[PDB]
């Protein structure tokens, strides 16, 4: 469920945020994004990439 | 800050309160010290 303040646990990552589509393009190997402050900001959905 | 993980949620997710408190009390001491220093920086700088 997207664009809604949803409690999420990804690959067992866990946390609360608003899931939205990201235009940023991962390189194929990368899995978890991160911030300037080293906080999770971009994630790859496990089931569908 | 000498705790198992810098992420608070990771600590909460993996280990339950009785041992969690020892871990979290470490972060609270650390984070609060960092917050306290930043404010004292600002108060002095705002005086300038």
From Swiss-Prot, chain A:
Protein name, per record: Spike protein S1
Purpose of the protein: Attaches the virion to the cell membrane by interacting with host receptor, initiating the infection. The major receptor is host ACE2. When S2/S2' has been cleaved, binding to the receptor triggers direct fusion at the cell membrane. When S2/S2' has not been cleaved, binding to the receptor results in internalization of the virus by endocytosis using host TFRC and GRM2 and leading to fusion of the virion membrane with the host endosomal membrane. Alternatively, may use NRP1/NRP2 and integrin as entry receptors.
Parent sequence residues shown: 534 to 582 of 1273
Self-association state and partner proteins as the record states: Binds to host ACE2. RBD also interacts with the N-linked glycan on 'Asn-90' of ACE2. Cleavage of S generates a polybasic C-terminal sequence on S1 that binds to host Neuropilin-1 (NRP1) and Neuropilin-2 (NRP2) receptors. Interacts with host integrin alpha-5/beta-1 (ITGA5:ITGB1) and with ACE2 in complex with integrin alpha-5/beta-1 (ITGA5:ITGB1). May interact via cytoplasmic c-terminus with M protein. May interact (via N-terminus) with host bilirubin and biliverdin, thereby preventing antibody binding to the SARS-CoV-2 spike NTD via an allosteric mechanism.
């Amino acid at each position: 469920v997207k664009n809604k303040c949803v409690n999420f646990n990804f690959n067992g990552l866990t946390g609360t945020g608003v899931l939205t589509e990201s235009n940023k393009k991962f390189l194929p190997f990368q899995q978890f994004g991160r911030d300037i402050a080293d906080t999770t900001d971009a994630v790859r959905d496990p089931q569908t990439l | 800050f000498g705790a198992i993980s810098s992420v608070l949620n990771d600590i909460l997710s993996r280990l339950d309160p009785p041992e969690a408190e020892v871990q979290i009390d470490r972060l609270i001491t650390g984070r609060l010290q960092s917050l306290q220093t930043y404010v004292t920086q600002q108060l002095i700088r705002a005086a300038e």
